[PDB]
Every structure is written in C-alpha cells, then in structure tokens.
C-alpha cells in the first residue's frame, strides 16, 4: 500500500531518515555532534561595479544582428598566437622549447582556474 511512484524525500519516513534537497555543504561535523562552518566552503558572489555601464537588458530593433560564427579553437589561435609566431619566424627568434613565451601552458597544475579538470564553477 506504499506509493511506489512518488519521489523519496526527507519529509517521508521516520525521524531518523533524512537527506538533503541538493544544498551544497558548507561545513564539517566534528566529534561530540558539533558543526564547524568553514568560510572557504561558503560561496562568495563577485559582483562588479555597474556605474557607467552602457548596456541594458534589451537591445534596439534598428540595430542589425551579425552572422553567427561559433568560435573555434583554430580561429582563436589565428587571432592571438599566430601573429606573434609569424613575426618571430621572420626574425628567426622561435624555438619549440619556448612555446610558453606565446602563452602555452604545459600543465594546468598550479593554475588557480584549471581548464581540465575544471576546479571552478560557473
């Protein structure tokens, strides 16, 4: 006679049964049943200063939209790194070892914002 089709949540079951609704944990439970919040585990919203901002939620109809071109890795490379290498190649001051000079990162370890695996949320 139990309803099998309804979702299993903490409102149901005895007192002992509990579970989260998806809220991210922000602290630790120490011995003796004491909660110790950790400030670093609490997200902090980085909010910019909007003074002098010239952009509003809606855009004018008169303004014409452009052609959609999903950005690709090749396109970014040509814009940023290709010109430096091209000029350097003419000057001859280019070597395989110093690709980092143009911005190459050998490993993501040591970066605050690791590209992969991502260590930063949206």
């Amino acid at each position: 006679g139990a309803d099998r089709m309804s979702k299993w949540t903490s409102k149901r079951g005895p007192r002992t049964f509990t579970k989260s609704r998806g809220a991210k944990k922000t602290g630790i439970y120490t011995s003796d049943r004491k909660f110790v919040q950790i400030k670093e585990m609490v997200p902090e919203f980085v909010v910019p200063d909007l003074t002098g901002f010239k952009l509003k939620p809606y855009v004018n109809y008169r303004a014409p939209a452009g052609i959609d071109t999903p950005l690709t890795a090749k396109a970014l490379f040509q814009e940023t790194v290709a010109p430096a290498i091209e000029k350097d190649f003419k000057e001859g001051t280019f070597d395989a070892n110093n690709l980092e000079k143009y911005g190459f990162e050998p490993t993501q370890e040591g970066k605050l914002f690791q590209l992969y695996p991502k260590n930063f949320p949206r």
Partner: peptide
C-alpha cells in the same frame, strides 16, 4: 495484514 513501516519496506 499490512502494517506500514518505511524501514521494513525499503
């Protein structure tokens, strides 16, 4: 006969 208990059921 059915004496519902969630711990028993699960």
């Amino acid at each position: 006969e059915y004496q519902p208990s969630n711990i028993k059921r699960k």
